[PDB]
């Protein structure tokens, strides 16, 4: 079972039924019967007479399903057309459900919640990556590395066969021009040479920087790339600890 | 591997190539070669002169993948050309695709086949499974009042202020864009030191009012209650 | 936990912030601050200055998440006004991320890649499925099978109760007329008789072929379908 969307598509239908209500009172009956068809039993509601404006579902996304609770994020619009009065709302919307013999139903009244922000904060300053150290390495080694990297970065943006000469398992990139090496700290690791590198590429008319960790093996007068990452680790200059 | 859509996007492409055929006879050639590129080898079909009208794919969704079989739900329209006019007939069906993988790459291995779209809605329910909110509890009139007085504060806070809510309840987030309106129902049940309230109440969001259900687990604190646990369902077997 | 899209929706927001830059050189500042809010710390960039044209995100899809690396496929347009030049580009776009207490952040500069083709090739010709063999099986069995399969295929397109008489656990199909059996190779396997079959169905005004493997058990004067597959195996004429 690599994929199973049956539940999700079901609840998507529920959510549409619930947040959809047209203006014409005729057609407004059928809509509610469509909605009631989702429940095992229409929920027992003591309240006398709910008020209910016409509504359109603008956007729905299932964020999680945990136990017998599905949680959506919803954006819907409430309209009275006479001239038009409108409001747009977003909310969380939580649906209690269950399964009978591979079939689904809504089991209960849904409930509203706030959409939670996903972004983390409160970061230790110890977790920041500053690219400010300098290595105490030869200018001659720096020249050799620098000369290798222009070839590498040329190949990495242009030719797969050439890249395979100087690097293991590295795919080339599309639609890109190499421009500049802007940073390079070198660290000997027994027989390997780690290069931590930031460089500059142009895609269309726009340039971006990216970071690399190269693991270099000596071959001929030059290098071979045994391993390439796309992040510089925080502990990159730990030849100093 | 938290997420992997590679297969799904692939099959999405297959399904579009299969249910798409334009009118322009020049463009209609290339479309078939595009389709044939999905298979390892174009499937062997004995029947000659298949009848293939133009069609447009209106909608496709992968519903499951099991083994080397993908199952879609499809809505497409065929453009059937008469003499006097043209017909546009709209069909939905299920559509099952046999596939395989070579070294993290994909291909369609076989002729796909059509099926009925499964209804996902359950039915034929025992009446024993319904939630009937009718009873009056065996529980004191005075407790009824104290709970009722607590719940207006709770519900006020639950819709208005996080700090206040934390005084009277553990780990309960407030709700957005909501006004409290009414408590409409309340059955109380003694559980040793705790008091379970089953509660239905009425909120206004925008210009619309909805009912919702709660199970509170209430602990005595001061002259009042503390909310140890809050659920958003009343359980079927809630009474005595 | 059947479903959890929290990460995916997060990275969708990142990708929109990154590939979006409006023309107004002032509302262009707030956009960058919106983008910077994703990272734990705004990445340290040694290169000075940098050229950034307005851009609109046309399309994004997360293809994989592996470790702390998300990989997208992206389609965006760059808008250069001087009249208007628009470049439309697709690329891969890889985002390094992490989680603190069920929350997310982008941890580093993202990087571009080629969108990998998903289609396999380089197939052995031994793996092609040709329906071209003829069985060395009696002409009388051929007739009995043929007569069964018209009933089966009629039922399979028309009536569930009838289908259950002649087959275990086979759902009928909707909106379909049976038309023709176009191929049939028969093979005894111990007690069962395997039929490999291709037939022709009409849905709307269009006809398609499909393939079946039936496992047939003798019942009465006829067959019972113990197992139905929808693919003929490569090694069928064994």
UniProtKB/TrEMBL annotation, chain A:
Which keywords fit this entry according to its UniProt record? Membrane, Transmembrane, Transmembrane helix
Q: Which domain of life, per UniProt? A: Bacteria
Statement: the UniProt record of this protein carries the keyword Cell wall biogenesis/degradation:
no
Keyword presence, Iron: no
Q: What is this protein called?
A: Putative transfer protein
Give the stretch of the parent protein shown, with its full length.
89 to 331 of 331
């Amino acid at each position: 079972r690599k994929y199973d969307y049956k539940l999700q598509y079901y609840l998507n239908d529920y959510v549409y039924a619930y947040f959809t209500l047209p203006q014409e009172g005729d057609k407004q009956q059928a809509q509610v019967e469509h909605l009631n068809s989702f429940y095992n039993f229409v929920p027992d509601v003591k309240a006398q007479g709910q008020v209910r404006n016409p509504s359109t579902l603008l956007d729905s996304q299932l964020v999680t399903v945990e136990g017998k609770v599905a949680t959506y994020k919803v954006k819907y619009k409430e309209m009275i057309q006479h001239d038009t009065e409108e409001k747009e709302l977003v909310t969380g919307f939580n649906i209690p459900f269950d399964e009978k013999e591979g079939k689904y139903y809504v089991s209960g009244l849904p409930w509203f919640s706030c959409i939670e922000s996903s972004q983390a904060g409160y970061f230790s300053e110890d977790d920041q990556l500053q690219l400010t150290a300098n290595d105490h390495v030869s200018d001659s080694q720096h020249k050799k590395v620098e000369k290798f990297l222009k070839v590498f970065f040329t190949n990495y943006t242009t030719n797969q066969d050439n890249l395979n000469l100087i690097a293991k398992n590295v795919a080339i990139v599309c639609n890109t021009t190499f421009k500049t090496i802007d940073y390079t700290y070198l660290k000997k690791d027994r027989a390997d040479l780690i290069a931590y590198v930031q460089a500059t590429f142009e895609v269309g008319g726009t340039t971006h920087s990216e970071n690399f960790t190269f693991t270099l093996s000596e071959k001929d007068k030059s290098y071979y790339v045994t391993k390439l990452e796309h992040t510089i680790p925080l502990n990159y200059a730990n030849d100093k600890d």
